[PDB]
Amino acid sequence: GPLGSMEDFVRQCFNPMIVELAEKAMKEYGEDPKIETNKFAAICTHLEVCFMYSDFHFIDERGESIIVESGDPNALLKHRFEIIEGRDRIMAWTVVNSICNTTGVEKPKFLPDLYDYKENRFIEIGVTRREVHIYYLEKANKIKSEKTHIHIFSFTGEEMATKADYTLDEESRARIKTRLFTIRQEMASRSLWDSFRQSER
Ligand SMILES: [Mn+2]
Ligand SMILES: [Mn+2]
Ligand SMILES: [Mn+2]
């Protein structure tokens, strides 16, 4: 089939908000999205998974975690997750500080992705084109804050999470895995997948 461009794939297949956030992140880190294109797509994918992980999850009036998939959460519901990823450096650390000196949870050494108000912990999300165990170990060896919970998704449906604690219900994680499948399938249709997979390194 014809080889498409990754740029076209990213612009067509991700919400413009996600794409803009990804471009902003690459700029902050001195990366060119028109050159490291596989990285660009990976950044978009990771941001989308961070958002999907938080979507629909609230803390109810009694303090219990609940799922609301309708458009209107009742006014008293509180979002279960704080999203750190997607924020510029100053704001991300600002949020992390606000959570920490507040909830009493200690301050991480690297910016995590999410904070979970039900489980009272930061979360590092990962999305890998490689084996989940290898990637889990890479993440873990990097941070070892060891209050930070790690949850890795792959494009083939495998997951690995700290202490075999997966945080979310099966259906929430199935939504993420379905999206990852869809991304893989669409990139493959455009003859972009093999190279994207091999680029992770
Ligand atoms: Mn809301
Ligand atoms: Mn992050
Ligand atoms: Mn991450």
150 within 8 A of 166, measured Cβ to Cβ: no
How many CB atoms lie under 10 A from the CB of residue 14? 21
21 Cα: distance to centroid of ligand 2 (angstroms) = 12
187 within 8 A of 8, measured Cβ to Cβ: no
115 Cα: distance to centroid of ligand 3 (angstroms) = 12
Q: What is the DSSP letter of 31?
A: -
Q: Is the dihedral of CA 84, 85, 87, 89 positive or negative?
A: positive
Strand 65-67 relative to strand 57-59: parallel, antiparallel, unpaired?
antiparallel
162 within 8 A of 187, measured Cβ to Cβ: no
From its phi and psi, is residue 78 left (phi > 0), alpha (psi between -120 and 50) or beta?
beta
Range of the domain at 61: 1-201
Q: Is the dihedral of CA 44, 193, 195, 133 positive or negative?
A: positive
135 within 8 A of 142, measured Cβ to Cβ: no
Which ligand is closest in space to the CA of residue 136?
3
62 Cα: distance to centroid of ligand 1 (angstroms) = 17
Strand 121-128 relative to strand 149-154: parallel, antiparallel, unpaired?
parallel
Our answer to whether residue 139 is catalytic in this structure is: yes
Strand (E) or helix (H) holding 37: helix 37-54
> Quick one: resolution in A?
1.5
Our answer to whether residue 169 is catalytic in this structure is: no
Can you tell me whether residue 59 is helix, strand or coil? strand
Catalytic residue among 82, 113, 116, 124: 113
Number of domains in the chain: 1
Our answer to whether residue 116 is catalytic in this structure is: no
192 Cα: distance to centroid of ligand 1 (angstroms) = 36
CA distance 26 to 194: 23
DSSP 78-139: EESEEE-TTS-HHHHHHHHHHHHHHH-PPPPSS--SEEETTTTEEEEEEEESS-HHHHHHHH
Catalytic residue among 82, 85, 116, 124: 85
130 within 8 A of 198, measured Cβ to Cβ: no
162 within 8 A of 121, measured Cβ to Cβ: no
CA distance 199 to 52: 24
How many CB atoms lie under 10 A from the CB of residue 129? 19
CA distance 108 to 144: 9
Catalytic residue among 23, 124, 139, 177: 139
CA distance 147 to 106: 8
126 Cα: distance to centroid of ligand 3 (angstroms) = 5
Residues surrounding ion ligand 3 at CB below 5 Å: 113, 125
70 class by beta-carbon count within 10 Å (0-12 exposed, 13-18 middle, 19+ buried): exposed
Among residues 36, 3, 1, which one has the least CA distance to residue 22?
Answer: 36
CA distance 40 to 159: 22
